[PDB]
Amino acid sequence: ADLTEYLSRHYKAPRMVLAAAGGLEHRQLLDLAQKHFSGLSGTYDEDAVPTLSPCRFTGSQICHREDGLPLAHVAIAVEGPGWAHPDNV
Amino acid sequence: MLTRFLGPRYRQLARNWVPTAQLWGAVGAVGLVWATDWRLILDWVPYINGKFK
Amino acid sequence: KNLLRNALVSHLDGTTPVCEDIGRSLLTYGRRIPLAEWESRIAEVDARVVREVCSKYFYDQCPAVAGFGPIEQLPDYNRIRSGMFWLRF
Amino acid sequence: TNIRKSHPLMKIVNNAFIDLPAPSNISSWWNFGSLLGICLILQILTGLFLAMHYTSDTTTAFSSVTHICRDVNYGWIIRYMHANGASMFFICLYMHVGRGLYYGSYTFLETWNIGVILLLTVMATAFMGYVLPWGQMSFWGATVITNLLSAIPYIGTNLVEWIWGGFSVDKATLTRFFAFHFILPFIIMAIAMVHLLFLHETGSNNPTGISSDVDKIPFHPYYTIKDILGALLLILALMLLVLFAPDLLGDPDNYTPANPLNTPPHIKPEWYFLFAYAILRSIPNKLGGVLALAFSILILALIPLLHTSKQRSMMFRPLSQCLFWALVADLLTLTWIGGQPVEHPYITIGQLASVLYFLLILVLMPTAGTIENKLLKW
Amino acid sequence: APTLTARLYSLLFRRTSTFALTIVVGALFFERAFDQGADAIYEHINEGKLWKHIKHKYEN
Amino acid sequence: AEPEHDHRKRMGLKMLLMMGLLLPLVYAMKRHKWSVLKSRKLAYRPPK
Amino acid sequence: VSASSRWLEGIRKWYYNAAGFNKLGLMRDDTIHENDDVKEAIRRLPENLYDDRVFRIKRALDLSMRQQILPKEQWTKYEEDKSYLEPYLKEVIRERKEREEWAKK
Ligand code: HEM
Ligand code: HEM
């Protein structure tokens, strides 16, 4: 029940993208998509609003000391802008 | 023979630290002034005239 | 910039890597950013843009540090924090 | 590569207060090491500015100091900071040694011992210090004390006159003391570094006496700023005296020049020797009195040989914790008696306090320790 | 409209240059204004000065 | 006996007034830096 | 077993609570002065004990710094205080003494 409800909650057309690359022709892809995918959002949901709330960043630090490991891993980061910001380049 | 530092990059490095080197002289001048109560220079500053009437 | 151009072009080699870029990009950018556009974005970049863009995200910013292993010598968060600015500048 | 680590000079500085690992754990009782340092330099620093105006010569001695206080631009703050810093240097020295016993720090033999050497020297220094202005207290203070070496069998006489330059305190004695009061703080300053050298060999002890290796923090941020705040507090105190109560801790009669004819029935060394003063005269003996006076301080070097407890700090030791405070209060007693005339109540009580002192450190604390062991099943 | 502290950080605290410049510029004006207000407070609570005593001796 | 008397106390006022801004400040500074340590959280996670 | 043996036990339980290390989560043995013998026994502890001892002392040093203590229901209950280091310490002392004894002949 936990699963199926996450499925129906999230596997909805406006959030799926059929992608392909190679020896195909776009029309053939469209045909297929319309043949095997038609009827996924024949029901646009009432008030299920899958919207991502922004996520707070925290200047913080987690140290898992373990002198039994031979080498240490460290990862330091700063808050980035996100997918769409032109600053990425 | 300081020719090792003559090139495009050095010219760019030099220019990048121009504002810093400038502002760092502003800090020192004002700093020297304020510390020795420079009679000459200070008279010009609007307030800070503890030697007027 | 050249590294990044090489990376990009090299990464997009073969059906899978491309297909994945299509599908994923549609999700993230809403569209597919044609190689040319990335090339134009990269070309725009030069020293000034780097300094300005780097300073915007790294300069005097609060890090998120993660440590694991023999980390006794991993510097204190204050110390790491102080390393995120220069007293000369 | 980080030059802050490989440069012959910085190394030392990195090891002193930047990268040195310290207990995440120490508290205010660990500040008095910086404070003593600060004290030492500030003392050296005002002390020097007084020397550019002071003299020596019995005729001008007193005159020069007043010259400074009245004529020398700002000579007064300098003079009073010097004299008040001197007292503060004792408050801290006292607190430092205190912190030390309570917490068991003395287990670092070499370090503790260098610290005892540091104690006698600043004592020896500050003594010579107050002889300088050539006041009443200066003269007989310089007399009552020095003499003590005349209690030493067979050669006492010789030495006391050798340290005098005559048959009494005069000409030869003021110049001597000034010069010694000048070279000592430098020598102390050296010894301090060796003190600190041996300290770095083990790192610092802490409030629990346990061992902080499992939780060390960098001196960087942490103890540098907790030393700054601390030093500000030391400045508040030193300035409170100088600027509001300059003579509160100073005997008013070191004013009015010397006079080998007088002697003003009262006379006691500066406050910081009162406990010691009390001990000495709480004994009807020339030899015993001075012998006891010596033991009064040289016993610190004995403490480690009477550590009996299985725990290091007294943090978890109620029994000893009680005897510690009894020691402090009892020292506060000796200080008070020392400050009083050798008369009725005052005699017998200061005589009891003395015995207490030695019996407490030599028998009581060592036993309290063993009982605690037994109580814990150790 | 951001914050005073925010705007203050951007224009003067960010760079250690301007940061330091700010404090040397800020110390000069502080020494002056603190010495005014202070002495004034010191006088106001006094008045057995040699200031109000002068009015009597402009002559000789 | 004490000519400096009045200046002494004039400075003394400034000394109190100065320390009145500094003590709190140089103290808030030390807090900042120690706050990393003061709110630090430990967890012990042994094997099994 | 005596009425008075409970008294000695009672004086001991009393001192324990007074000594106070239990408020910091320590165990009696976590507070021993480290000397050669004690260092050697610390060396001989099996992983888990050693690790637990480290965590304890870390927890105390941490408390000690914040100048706090543990909630009362988490203090080390005397009698639940495991003497985990005594057997090693005792063995390290025995062997030293054997040496000390051999050095006399
Ligand atoms: C010239 C006067 C002295 C100076 C400048 C001086 C300086 C210092 C400094 C900087 C520390 C480390 C910081 C601290 O623990 O507070 C320290 C610790 C210590 N000093 Fe001194 N000290 C002096 C007199 C003494 C005295 C009188 C003793 C005891 C006779 C002493 C024995 C120790 C010991 C045992 C420690 C270790 C403290 C600990 O680990 O907890 N030193 N000293
Ligand atoms: C080497 C740096 C020092 C120099 C150059 C120095 C020089 C002097 C001089 C010239 C005087 C006489 C002027 C006066 O009494 O105000 C004096 C007084 C004194 N200084 Fe020093 N001294 C130095 C370090 C010390 C130290 C380490 C102490 C011990 C805390 C010390 C404590 C005293 C004392 C107790 C007096 C006399 C007390 C008094 O002023 O009433 N000074 N010093």
Ligand SMILES: CCCCCC[C@H]1C(=O)O[C@H](C)[C@H](NC(=O)c2cccc(NC=O)c2O)C(=O)O[C@@H](C)[C@@H]1OC(=O)C(C)C
């Ligand atoms: C000139 C100033 C640079 C400093 C180098 C010399 C000074 C020096 O070595 O600095 C560090 C700071 C040294 N240790 C500490 O302060 C210190 C150590 C543990 C804990 C705390 N505090 C709170 O837990 C401390 O404060 C200390 O404080 O010793 C002084 C006596 C010494 O000073 C001396 O030698 C004199 C002989 C100069």
